[PDB]
Amino acid sequence: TLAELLGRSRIAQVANNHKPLTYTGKKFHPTHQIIETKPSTLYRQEWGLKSAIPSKIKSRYLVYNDLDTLERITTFEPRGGTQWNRLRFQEMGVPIVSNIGRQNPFFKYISRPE
Amino acid sequence: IHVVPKLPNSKALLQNGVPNILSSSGFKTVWFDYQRYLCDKLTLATAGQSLESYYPFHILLKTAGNPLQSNIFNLASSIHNNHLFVENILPSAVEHGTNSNAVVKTEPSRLFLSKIKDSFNGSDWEVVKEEMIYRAENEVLGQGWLFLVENNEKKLFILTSNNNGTPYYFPRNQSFDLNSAISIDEFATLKQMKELIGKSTKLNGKVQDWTMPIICVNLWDHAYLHDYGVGNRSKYVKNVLDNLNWSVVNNRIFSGI
Amino acid sequence: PNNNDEVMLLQQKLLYDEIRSELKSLSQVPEDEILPELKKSLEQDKLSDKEQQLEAELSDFFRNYALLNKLFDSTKPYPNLIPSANDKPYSSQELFLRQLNHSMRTAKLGATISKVYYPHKDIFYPPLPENITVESLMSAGVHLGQSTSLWRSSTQSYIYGEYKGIHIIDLNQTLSYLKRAAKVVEGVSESGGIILFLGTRQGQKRGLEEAAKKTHGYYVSTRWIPGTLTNSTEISGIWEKQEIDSNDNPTERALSPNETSKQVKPDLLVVLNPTENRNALLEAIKSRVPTIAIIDTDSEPSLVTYPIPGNDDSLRSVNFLLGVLARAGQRGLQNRLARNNE
Amino acid sequence: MKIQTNAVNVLQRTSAYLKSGLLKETPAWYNVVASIPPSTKFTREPRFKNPSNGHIIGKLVDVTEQPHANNKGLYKTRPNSSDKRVGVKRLYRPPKLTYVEDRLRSLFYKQHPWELSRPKILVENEIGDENYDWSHMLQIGRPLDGESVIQRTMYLIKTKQYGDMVEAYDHARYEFYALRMQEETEQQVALEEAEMFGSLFGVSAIEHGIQKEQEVLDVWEKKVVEETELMAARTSN
Ligand SMILES: [Mg+2]
């Protein structure tokens, strides 16, 4: 059915987020999912959102909150810069270690009631 | 999704391999298995990204300058190189499946043999083949690729790559093995290359290289071991260079008409 | 095998450059250096029977193809390329042509690409209306309506539900409405009617121009002049009309001034963005011109004869629906040109 | 806006022009529209089911269907005020589509904030071509991301291998960690191996950031100096 397809659509895959797109507090990790469009689609203002992104946007990365609003605009910011922070961390090749010597969370360890 | 290209006369290739070079089992390893292995890994690496809509040759150029995309570059370079090798060693590029053609006598063209003499100080094609076999045995300790390339100055020269090294982009030719020791002359070449890459003003730190391959020989174990065995890779390279498809190799040389 | 043939020409080409270069060298030398010495030689020379042969053979050869000739009358690719010397490196132009050769043959070796969306193919390879699925419509984003805050409740029956603060258009109805609209375009095209494609949102021109081209129709991408249909004589009378046969070939018959001032009304109007083209829709109603339009959740369905429920804000969705309608028109045109042949 | 009449009746208004003789020649569209009638009802249509979750719309539970006591310990013997209000509006309001997967998606990205930094392409290729076997997480054609985990979790609960959604989710999460660790190593090793064979790179990611920060820090230097000189003059007053 159409409902089944919609639930699995790429737009459905992005978790609902209404966090401020302009946040001036302390940032410790990414808050919005970066959206990327290919160069061919960018030439046609196609991002896979509800409406065409304004042609003024030359970046290929954005973050958004609402597909449409009462102001008849998309709420988005044309930035994708948290990906470069992650890739620069990867280039520094420093593994993240636990200062408390806890078990690795990414391994299925056999824990006990200690 | 990147899919393995269909090859001309594929039924013959799956039955009698490539005559005088590979058997049926040897060709299944190099192309039907390894090419599937590469394309699947490339699809897993690039699916969901902008690179999925680009052909492997364009992917390697786009990613050649990105250190953390080397895995994608290696897969794209290997995929492009393997079909360059399988294309010039193929009995016939045209599909004589319904024409049952068994007479394909391809010989070096006049333009190729004229550029060989010009670029190799009058050496004949046979002598150049011996230099190519020698270069492969002494410069490629393990996996790699042997190329006959043409540069912007119309000169044919021999390039060898380690593992998946592209002939198109000199910063990624991977012609020097730094695991072993290098001479001061090799270090000078590397130092000069680094200076050229630093003169580029582009924010992507990319340079212009117009080198193009003419002949490609796969020096990976996936191509020779099963039929020749460890240590007999020079007998494999000799057979490949003696049974090249010159309809393809001649077409790779720019004529200008 | 035949390279020598080209070599024979190049030889002459090189010789021609040599002759021209030293023709210009003698154009600088003063006449006092050459002329008197040259004339003196002739004064000290005696013509022979053979020398005289060319004395008059060249006079006529120069009095026939230089003086008594008509100065005027009442390698195919890149024919202006200046090839470089075989010793010199490739020129910038030759490198471009050398790269183009590589692009055709080698650049696409290694893999083929399947199941990847290319935006241009929506315009140049639109599907037929019978092969369209809900999946295809959904892939194009046609189901994404407006914000629930902007709902025009007259569209209620087209809505499948609300999701992520927007109304989801029911693609099952979109498909049925699209098929009906496509058949209308095909009918009008097969009947020889004038089909006008109107869309004034940025980026729609390319789709609009190709749609008109493949249906032998017309398009407007810039601005709908208010009165184009109701005040046609004051706006469009000056522009040229033409007579055409059943094969859409110009008959070439000159048109009487009476025939060139008559209103030429479209037989069918397709509107990509009806919410911004109220003027055109009202003129179509006044002029009894049937209309097709994409109706988004905030758009009034009753203003058009054949609504197509769908997202009107995305160029992909619009160009997908326009492409289907354009191909439907093309099939009607091809069926009309075929019945004329047989 | 009023339901318009004149857009859908062009055929009937035209037919009056032709019958009277006001219009001599039949238009080319006339026959086509006659064979394909426009839809002219423009009605609001009721709906009795939410297509997403199959919830029934328009059903009233009668007191006879609630024989047992409630959470408060009281029996229901009469309709309550809500039961006595007409609910016709619910039949016509577009149903809110909901999905269990949406709850897991929000959880996954709350647990793994940096997965958001991995760019996602929302442009679809062809939804109808997706032939996925969710017995395994990796699939040819799609990236490895949070959605791979969600779809794997649903397959586990659908095959009844796990009963609780949490257990299926945790099982899928570990499969995701294993695949992510193999990719982080393939990239590190590929870079290391290339440098060992003489690969050269112009600008690294760290270098790219330094250059961009310099461009900004240079403009900032000028403005700071300018605004630290206007203050000195303005304050002198
Ligand atoms: Mg809209």
Curated annotation (Swiss-Prot), chain A:
Superkingdom field: Eukaryota
Q: Which residues form a coiled coil?
A: none
Instruction: Provide the protein's localization.
Output: Mitochondrion
| Function noted in UniProt | Component of the mitochondrial ribosome (mitoribosome), a dedicated translation machinery responsible for the synthesis of mitochondrial genome-encoded proteins, including at least some of the essential transmembrane subunits of the mitochondrial respiratory chain. The mitoribosomes are attached to the mitochondrial inner membrane and translation products are cotranslationally integrated into the membrane. bS1m functionally interacts with the 5'-UTR of mitochondrial mRNAs.
Other remarks in the entry: Present with 656 molecules/cell in log phase SD medium.
* Subunit structure, as described in the record: Component of the mitochondrial small ribosomal subunit (mt-SSU). Mature yeast 74S mitochondrial ribosomes consist of a small (37S) and a large (54S) subunit. The 37S small subunit contains a 15S ribosomal RNA (15S mt-rRNA) and 34 different proteins. The 54S large subunit contains a 21S rRNA (21S mt-rRNA) and 46 different proteins.
Membership in a protein family = Belongs to the bacterial ribosomal protein bS1 family.
Give the protein name, as stated in the record: Small ribosomal subunit protein bS1m
Organism in which the protein naturally occurs? Saccharomyces cerevisiae (strain ATCC 204508 / S288c) (Baker's yeast)
Swiss-Prot record, chain B:
This protein's record includes keyword Ribosomal protein: yes
Gene Ontology terms, cellular component aspect? Answer: cytoplasm; mitochondrial inner membrane; mitochondrial small ribosomal subunit; mitochondrion
One annotated GO molecular function is: structural constituent of ribosome
Keywords, A to Z? Mitochondrion, Ribonucleoprotein, Ribosomal protein
Localization of this protein = Mitochondrion
| Cited SUPFAM superfamilies | Fe,Mn superoxide dismutase (SOD), C-terminal domain, Fe,Mn superoxide dismutase (SOD), N-terminal domain
UniProt key word Ribonucleoprotein: yes
The superkingdom listed in its UniProt entry is Eukaryota
Q: Which InterPro entries match?
A: Mn/Fe_SOD_C, Mn/Fe_SOD_N_sf, SOD_C_sf
Q: Which GO terms describe its biological process?
A: mitochondrial translation
Q: Name one Pfam family in it.
A: Sod_Fe_C
Annotated function: Component of the mitochondrial ribosome (mitoribosome), a dedicated translation machinery responsible for the synthesis of mitochondrial genome-encoded proteins, including at least some of the essential transmembrane subunits of the mitochondrial respiratory chain. The mitoribosomes are attached to the mitochondrial inner membrane and translation products are cotranslationally integrated into the membrane.
Quote additional remarks: Present with 2060 molecules/cell in log phase SD medium.
* UniProt record similarity statement: Belongs to the mitochondrion-specific ribosomal protein mS42 family.
Please state what the protein is called: Small ribosomal subunit protein mS42
Which species is listed as the source?
A: Saccharomyces cerevisiae (strain ATCC 204508 / S288c)
From Swiss-Prot, chain C:
MF (Gene Ontology): structural constituent of ribosome
Which UniProt keywords are listed?
Mitochondrion, Ribonucleoprotein, Ribosomal protein, Transit peptide
Q: Where in the cell is it found?
A: Mitochondrion
- List, alphabetically, the InterPro entries matched: Ribosomal_uS2 (IPR001865), Ribosomal_uS2_bac/mit/plastid (IPR005706), Ribosomal_uS2_CS (IPR018130), Ribosomal_uS2_flav_dom_sf (IPR023591)
* Chain coiled-coil ranges: none
Lineage: superkingdom: Eukaryota
Q: Name one GO cellular component term.
A: mitochondrial inner membrane
**Record carries keyword Ribosomal protein:** yes
What is the predominant subcellular site recorded for this chain?
mitochondrion
- Write down the Pfam families for this protein, in alphabetical order: Ribosomal_S2
Biological process terms from the Gene Ontology for this record are:
mitochondrial translation
Q: Give the record's subunit note.
A: Component of the mitochondrial small ribosomal subunit (mt-SSU). Mature yeast 74S mitochondrial ribosomes consist of a small (37S) and a large (54S) subunit. The 37S small subunit contains a 15S ribosomal RNA (15S mt-rRNA) and 34 different proteins. The 54S large subunit contains a 21S rRNA (21S mt-rRNA) and 46 different proteins.
Q: Other comments?
A: Present with 6890 molecules/cell in log phase SD medium.
Q: Which PANTHER family match?
A: 30S RIBOSOMAL PROTEIN S2 PROKARYOTIC AND ORGANELLAR, SMALL RIBOSOMAL SUBUNIT PROTEIN US2M
Q: Its biological function?
A: Component of the mitochondrial ribosome (mitoribosome), a dedicated translation machinery responsible for the synthesis of mitochondrial genome-encoded proteins, including at least some of the essential transmembrane subunits of the mitochondrial respiratory chain. The mitoribosomes are attached to the mitochondrial inner membrane and translation products are cotranslationally integrated into the membrane.
Curated annotation (Swiss-Prot), chain D:
Q: What is its main location?
A: mitochondrion
GO cellular component entries = mitochondrial inner membrane; mitochondrial small ribosomal subunit; mitochondrion
Q: Which Pfam families match?
A: MRP-S25
> Which keywords does this chain's UniProt record carry?
Mitochondrion, Ribonucleoprotein, Ribosomal protein
Give the protein family.
Belongs to the mitochondrion-specific ribosomal protein mS23 family.
Question: Beyond the main fields, what else does the record say?
Answer: Present with 1920 molecules/cell in log phase SD medium.
What function does the entry list?
Answer: Component of the mitochondrial ribosome (mitoribosome), a dedicated translation machinery responsible for the synthesis of mitochondrial genome-encoded proteins, including at least some of the essential transmembrane subunits of the mitochondrial respiratory chain. The mitoribosomes are attached to the mitochondrial inner membrane and translation products are cotranslationally integrated into the membrane.
Name this polypeptide is given: Small ribosomal subunit protein mS23
Provenance organism = Saccharomyces cerevisiae (strain ATCC 204508 / S288c) (Baker's yeast)
